[model samples]
Target: KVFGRCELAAAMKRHGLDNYRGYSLGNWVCAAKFESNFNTQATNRNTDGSTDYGILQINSRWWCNDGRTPGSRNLCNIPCSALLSSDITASVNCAKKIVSDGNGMNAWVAWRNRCKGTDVQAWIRGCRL
Candidate 1:
């Protein structure tokens, strides 16, 4: 599913991403915009042959098992295909695990380069929470 900005914001909040760790909802919203443009089915094959999956691009290297990442930890204990679902439960859970494991939003390079230390409130502006 390709989500409207407000729709994604509301969804992520419902999934507990609002202020998970020290990051705010705007941060997740901004990261998702840059990471996958809110497309749940998005996938990117990294040069190392591992793939980034779903709206937040959970990676095959450490978070999911794609059966071809060479050394997947599957730390989230989820199949990579599940991250691509529009349901988003698996993706949101894995993302929280990524942060809980101490990587924080730094797990996503897009977040590091784009959303971090920037004014991200605009990402969720007028979204009404």
Candidate 2:
């Protein structure tokens, strides 16, 4: 199921993303907005023939297996479909693993493109933590 923006922000806060992996809650919410618009079932076909899955739009080529993505690293082990559910556990955990691996939020192009600026606080302002 898809989540509303504030709902996602609060959920993200509860998950401790405000300080996780050195990203602020604003950056987290901003990335989610640009990447998937808060939808859990979010998916996209990249120009590289890679697929990005989940709210984080994690790449199937390096994160999860979507069957059609050959030679996928699938570091998350969980199926890509697992990220399309209402429960955010798999999504959060897998994302944490990616951050721990390096690139930080830079692993997400959305974060790099849209959230790198200094004024991301608006993304979570009304969420009230």
Candidate 3:
């Protein structure tokens, strides 16, 4: 598992993805923390049989197809398994596409619930990135 906020910050910065559509690295970091505990392999099956994927927990319903699910939009054009990669470049790219669609971080339930209107600086506090 990734050990510190600085590391994840560096990954995001490496992707040149500090912010998009008016959302900050802070929002992305906070959502990652709440969604998957920073686990790259993280996934969760919805009650409906769809799943969320990777550090951002992107939904199979929208971004990727699990083969078992039919008519998945797959707007990211990458496999659902691709999101589970330890290297987050593709994941970050897909996430950028998602947030840029005028939805911003509202696409993430964690962002909407725990991060919205909260002091999110704690997600990056003391990270010397």
Candidate 4:
């Protein structure tokens, strides 16, 4: 059960995203695929004894802008933990906002251009989520 269609649709709705056009979900999926294979429970160790956690691979120590706990921010706030919480809608919606804000997706596009000839679709398909 990869990110089911219903869940994806709910995510799009929550984020005020148009369905698969202009700003497509595919773009978000592409980012997720490359970032962490959509593994919600994924985590990586840091040399400083901290960790980056969740599907988005968010560094809890850095990305928690809201005044929640260090790693307890939910989808409505941080979105990374939402991904780990199995709240795909929150995760994708948050990704949509990030992409729209000209930060994350811009970097992804730069990578895509540099990589050249990479099939984004294939990458998304390979992503487990």
Best by the lDDT measure: 1
* Deviation in Å, model 1, residue 120 alpha carbon: 0.8
lDDT of 1: 0.92
Q: Report the C-alpha lDDT of model 1 over 1-129, residue by residue, as the tens digit.
A: 999999999999999999999788999999999999999999999988999999999999999999998877989999999999989889999899898887788989999999999999889999877
Arranged by TM-score, best first: 1, 3, 2, 4
Please tell me which model should have the higher lDDT, number 2 or number 4.
2
Candidate 3 lDDT, 1-129, residue by residue in tens = 553677897788778777666667788888898988888889999987789998999888889877876667889988889988879988899998998888778889998999999988777778877
Error of 1 at 94 (Å): 0.4
lDDT of 1 at 64: 92
Model 2's lDDT to the true fold?
0.85
The Cα error of candidate 1 at residue 58, in Å, is 0.8
Off by over 4 Å in 3: 1-3
- Candidate 2: segments with Cα more than 4 A from true spot: none
Please list the C-alpha lDDT of all candidates, in the order they appear: 0.92, 0.85, 0.84, 0.50
Q: What is the lDDT of residue 75 in candidate 2?
A: 94
**Model 4, C-alpha of 112: deviation from truth (Å):** 4.8
